[PDB]
Symmetry: D2
Subunit: 445 residues, 4 copies
Amino acid sequence: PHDPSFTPTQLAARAAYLLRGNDLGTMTTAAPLLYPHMWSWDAAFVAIGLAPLSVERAVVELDTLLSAQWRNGMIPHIVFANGVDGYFPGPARWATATLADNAPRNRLTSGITQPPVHAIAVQRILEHARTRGRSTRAVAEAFLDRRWGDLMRWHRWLAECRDRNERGRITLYHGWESGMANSPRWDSAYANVVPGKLPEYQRADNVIITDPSQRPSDGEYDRYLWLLEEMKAVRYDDERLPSVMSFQVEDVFFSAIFSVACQVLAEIGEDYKRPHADVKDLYLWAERFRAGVVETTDQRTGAARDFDVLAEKWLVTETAAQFAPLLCGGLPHDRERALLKLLEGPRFCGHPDLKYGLIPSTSPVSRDFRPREYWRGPVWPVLTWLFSWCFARRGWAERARLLRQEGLRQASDGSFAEYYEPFTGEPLGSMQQSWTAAAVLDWLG
Amino acid sequence: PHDPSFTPTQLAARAAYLLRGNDLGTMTTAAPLLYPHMWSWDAAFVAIGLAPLSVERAVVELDTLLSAQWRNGMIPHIVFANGVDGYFPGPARWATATLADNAPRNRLTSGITQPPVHAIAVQRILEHARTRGRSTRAVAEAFLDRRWGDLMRWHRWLAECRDRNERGRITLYHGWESGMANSPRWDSAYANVVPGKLPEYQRADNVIITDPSQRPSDGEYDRYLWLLEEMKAVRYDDERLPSVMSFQVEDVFFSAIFSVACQVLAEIGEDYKRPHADVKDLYLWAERFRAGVVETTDQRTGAARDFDVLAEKWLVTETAAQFAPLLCGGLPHDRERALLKLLEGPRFCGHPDLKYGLIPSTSPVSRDFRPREYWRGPVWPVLTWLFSWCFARRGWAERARLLRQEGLRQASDGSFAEYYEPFTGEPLGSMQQSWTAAAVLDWLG
Amino acid sequence: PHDPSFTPTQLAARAAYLLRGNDLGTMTTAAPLLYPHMWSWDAAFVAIGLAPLSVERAVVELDTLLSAQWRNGMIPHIVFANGVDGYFPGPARWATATLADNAPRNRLTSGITQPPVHAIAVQRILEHARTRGRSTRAVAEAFLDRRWGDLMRWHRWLAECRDRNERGRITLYHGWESGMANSPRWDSAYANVVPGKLPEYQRADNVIITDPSQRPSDGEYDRYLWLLEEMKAVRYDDERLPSVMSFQVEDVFFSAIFSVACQVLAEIGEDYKRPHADVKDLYLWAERFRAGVVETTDQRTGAARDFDVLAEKWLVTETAAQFAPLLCGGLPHDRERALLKLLEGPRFCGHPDLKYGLIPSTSPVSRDFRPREYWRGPVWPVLTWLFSWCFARRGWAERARLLRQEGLRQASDGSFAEYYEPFTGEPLGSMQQSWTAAAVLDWLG
Amino acid sequence: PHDPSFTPTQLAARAAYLLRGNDLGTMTTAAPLLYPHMWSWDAAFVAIGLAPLSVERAVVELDTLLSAQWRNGMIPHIVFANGVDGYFPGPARWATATLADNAPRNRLTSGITQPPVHAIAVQRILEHARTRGRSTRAVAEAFLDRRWGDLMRWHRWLAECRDRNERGRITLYHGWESGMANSPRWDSAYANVVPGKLPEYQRADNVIITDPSQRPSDGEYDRYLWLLEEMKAVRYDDERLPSVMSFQVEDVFFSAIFSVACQVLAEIGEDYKRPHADVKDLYLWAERFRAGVVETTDQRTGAARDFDVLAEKWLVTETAAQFAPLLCGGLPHDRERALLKLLEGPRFCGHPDLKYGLIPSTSPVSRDFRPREYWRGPVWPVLTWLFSWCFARRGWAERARLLRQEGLRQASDGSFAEYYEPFTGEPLGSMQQSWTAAAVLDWLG
Ligand SMILES: O=C(O)[C@@H](CO)O[C@H]1O[C@H](CO)[C@@H](O)[C@H](O)[C@@H]1O
Ligand SMILES: O=C(O)[C@@H](CO)O[C@H]1O[C@H](CO)[C@@H](O)[C@H](O)[C@@H]1O
Ligand SMILES: O=C(O)[C@@H](CO)O[C@H]1O[C@H](CO)[C@@H](O)[C@H](O)[C@@H]1O
Ligand SMILES: O=C(O)[C@@H](CO)O[C@H]1O[C@H](CO)[C@@H](O)[C@H](O)[C@@H]1O
């Protein structure tokens, strides 16, 4: 009618209603239909959104994810719900159950990883639990007792197996591992992926999201699915991926997230008297990946570049990933001021046509910008949340507040959209996306 | 810790989280374990609590309840969840499936009724829907098209079959039909219930609520269960209940609720162009039961009395039911002022030991008062909500606001208790009670 | 930036900041410059806005107004601030200090009256005081002791001297007494006001509001000032005014306000044990003016008409005054439904081009509608407040809530404008208008 | 009644009402009667509280303070209101108008200084102005143009004249300069202050605060006033004070504030293109005083010590000043963790008897603790605000949020007390204290 927005209490109520509605029992789907399984970094954001509602159930969410952790420490990016269809590529296509010696016996999972935001969710659970009294603190502390080792194995696998040369950057073998498979970041690396005899398949994602402008193309999916074939042919063996994979990139945004997560997990380890050797290793990785991120940065603007390991070239694109060094710190004073100027100026948050003062996934002034197309332009509430939380942690209280305020204004339609059109504010992707509700729940306090 | 209360957004979020958690699919249980089925007047309050979250799902809740309506128009007070145990008396004990010719074929139900608050829930659904735009208005209007006749049959059954002498008061054959089975209101009528050979049974309610001070006694349950035997022996036939039932009371609070509900449903009928004959009948019943309520009232204080049909005597007790005339109107000016003075004074809301300025189910100064014992004293959030809504509808904006404010203060522990100790505020009865969350959700706006 | 609206806490703070800034010490100006004096019904609304801030200062505001009461009971519509210029007509033009035998010795005032909303402010003060404990209740009760007699003499002067024929409607001798001097309501009465030798004058209002479209015309001010000459010629004598005034109208909106105010003051009198004869007179007047308002109404639509006493003619116009019967009650059921349909429909709150669901001062479809011009069309926050408060007192809780919600949305720019353009929401008239801040303060709670 | 607390909107409104009520025109008194003049660091906090209400008036507050700046750059701690009495020592006792060659011609002031929080207020003004559009940004930028040089001269006077030896700590000649004249911090320095012939005087502070337990003793005031005699004897000459003053201490809390203020002002200078040499000096001083603060700290616990320059002795006490290093940064990792453990533990925020999780001015377990006595124990809302703002700037978002939440809980009585009893929450000192209202206004947002 005259304004279809919701009040803060109405919005918080609807966000919690959604998150419980996507709960299958011990895992929350990332969306009702498009993503009807557990996703790894979504599950961390879901736990953040559950923490104000039930510390016990937030802990269950991470327990379920960690129960699917591979024998070598990798957290796979999908934990499939038993008997659930409607998502492709599904467990039959990954075939990790029959081909991956490290895959868990009692869960079906994908064969690739996703960004290590999980320590941040643990910190939010602990902060909520400490406000709730003894029995709730005991729940969160029992979770640490039970899962500290698994969290360490996850970070160690990243540091040792995806940074084999100790360059302080994480190597990815699939664009899906960045969280942003169709980002302009990866276009030139995908151009060097030439599928062989790719087994026939039918997409499911664009049956649910039928507007073709909102999802990747068939040609992109052919390359996404071919990379799976290459992993399967070597049975997902870490030692063989560098020799066979047609896509090998160092992801500077994933790397900065890992730097932050190591520092966060290290602080948790000190607070809860975890083994000193573990805390020492976490701080070492935090510093190594901070330095690895800074090494990539533009000498004028501070913007961070990804790296194509096969082509041996810096990937220079105009996306939100450029702001990786803002997450983890480490830039010299003058270059971080330049990077913040880029963030706030007309190429990103200050673009004059934006409905909200938020960070588009791709700069609206880039030739690669597509305002509807998944990670090629739309504004993602999950990125707003991650940037706002990391900015508050840098001490940039007012910058963080402004992102939270605009994110709540954007979410006040109650669509809990996966992403939003940057100019019109139209909800895009899946509606009722779990991590969009989780951002709103964490923000509203 | 220093204050374990929740903010308004945290509380609204937790209330919605609870209501979705008690949703079995198309019905919401009244509580997780103590009441693991659909109850009739609880379902109306659940629909009120769902309306800010999903008009579609609020409508589903009433559709499910009305699908269990008996062939003669009676809405039974329990609609059992298929395959669910843990509540006594359960479907086997009622035996309406085999003995009640009017019971629905496709639902298991109890054999008695409960207060007709359902029109009030329809009004709240309609008010929410009108703020939400065309598609949501169409959902609520389709519900009226589908269920107006059933709602009329429900009111007609009450008016014709439970007020056979057109006295403007509803006759009950079980204390459970009042919603308040152990109220001091009914003690002298129960004293005239003498069980014959009562089939052996085991309670379930005091397995879940083990503190004996919070639930009725075994002796009370023996009388509750014997009344079932009397109904079963005549196969729940309306025409035979007056000849056989050992408990027959005119419930003045139920009667006042019915007066209000008739007026509310009549206004809905006018607004949505329902049949004129129906609207005329609803207004006639609204006036008849208003007059029936006023006829019972104390000539000094305005307090309303129940009536024992078998003993032919006015039941004079000191409970919240005395305030029935405040709900429906009709008292002369001077006597309603006296009744409000009683409400606000030291026998009820103004009692000096109360933690919150709320209406205890029994006056703390009555010899019958028990601060823990179900309907014999505790403060019930559902009654706070009903009184506050009816008071706002009388035009008593500040009185209604004060009840809402104290009700939210009391509920801010997030226990969503079934009822609360009036002096200490201790949560009692079931935790996570659906209609307590619904009151909070409606209030918070 | 992207959103120049204030949060509820920011807006409440700015509203209180404004009200204290317009405080001269013991009186609050109606605006900083346009209305740099105390106005009568503005002072009632200011007291309502002060009640949540300081019951003591709210009481002072009404004490200051009543200290200016005329010896016959009239509350004049302007109490001039000593030594303050910049408003015309000012004290020298009214000349009540030399001509009006009933004017107070110690205050400079105008010589006409304004609507009796004062009892409503007393109710709000009492309601706040009762939530704030004994010392604050004592302040408000002491005000009742000190000023009950003055309030009675105000209501009695209205009932006996402006309703000489006991028709239950208030006669006015100036459009300014209606609050709405350029309302289309008065156009045909003004058309029979033929000025004689009118002494020269210079307007001050359109020096401060320079946009000519927002204020009445010079021709209209000539008639406003000529009526002052007619009053002055008979020394403002109540007994002579009917013989000489060229403007004599029965104001149905003023009459409905008076009915409400009498009923409100009667209930205060009952609650605080004021003399029985006063309470009885107040209820008698409430009923008399309720009936007088109903007598004006169209038998189909319920719309209330004003009456031109000199022409002996019903004044049929399409302004917010038509809704007078909604404030005081009394209409038959069918007629009130019809009037509510007019209010909510496309001629008023339902007009498709309105920015906010609010009541414009003149219907946008009326030929007399002017969207910028004072009382000929703009939306007035003070009317929104008065309608919402009276609607809640009728029991129309949702209708009242919707007006409050839209009024807060409109006021969220922080301009505290006198009135707003109905289609664009542009702030018009004076900024920093005291009764717009008071409405916001009362609403926000 | 049952709950005398105010809602967030009511509290924000009352806080703004108070601040406007203490406004004399161009200066805001620190309290209505106890402190009926402008105080220096109070005026910074008042400007912070005014920024959400009127950027223009917030700027006026700092313009008025800086118009009283001494010719050598010192901002004096009191700017007296013309013709206002009731505070002692007043202008005649200081005699700066006749004795101090650097005192301003057009203002009566004291002859000592106070902590340099002023840059923090400038930052908050700028942050508000940037959310309010171009005309308001122009007001704040014009203030920078007009007053940047004065702010530089204030910081330069501190750095060059109160840190003559470039030790990175500020020397004080009076306990009043610390803000906390009766803090246990100064007891051993005061013990070596031996008054000579002290001219007779009559205290005013304990006429307004009559409870002797809330204010310093007569013996303490004799020493405070004797230090004024020593300053007066040398005409307040910066060059002579070290030779004559019986009280000379390095204040580590003042020093940490100065470090923060320099860094804040440097970032403002970079953002608004102020002279490079100024920005460079500001960063140099920020680093120098950060290091000077760290040099004072216990190597185990991180607790910061003050220094008695005359005794050449570290002053080891248990007050909130120990936490100075948390404001400015610089501690080694292990030492800062230890200091945070002290802050959160049973000697401060964790003490089991505190009503609120807040920082008392003296540790409750210290032998010097007095729960009512000014800076010897009470909880000061202004310190809560300063710690919370600095903590958020460190990146400690949850720690800052908890202080704000508890500070708002404590302030929800609406007394706006100067300080509060740490165990009972009783309001103490002056009511209606301006910087307590300003803290609430900044927090509520
Ligand atoms: O498009 C897909 O099929 C999945 C595959 O992982 O990715 C999207 O969907 C996932 C589930 O929300 C997210 O984790 C990703 O970041 C991404 O937005
Ligand atoms: O005690 C019980 O077993 C049930 C039987 O109907 O009654 C309570 O529980 C029901 C479910 O909440 C309520 O509808 C009733 O009013 C009452 O409080
Ligand atoms: O235009 C004027 O000069 C005055 C004359 O009384 O009226 C307006 O201004 C007055 C003060 O705000 C209001 O009381 C009136 O209702 C009206 O809007
Ligand atoms: O006690 C006094 O007379 C004054 C002297 O400056 O100090 C208090 O009062 C001043 C004004 O509130 C504060 O600035 C101080 O920090 C302190 O609390």
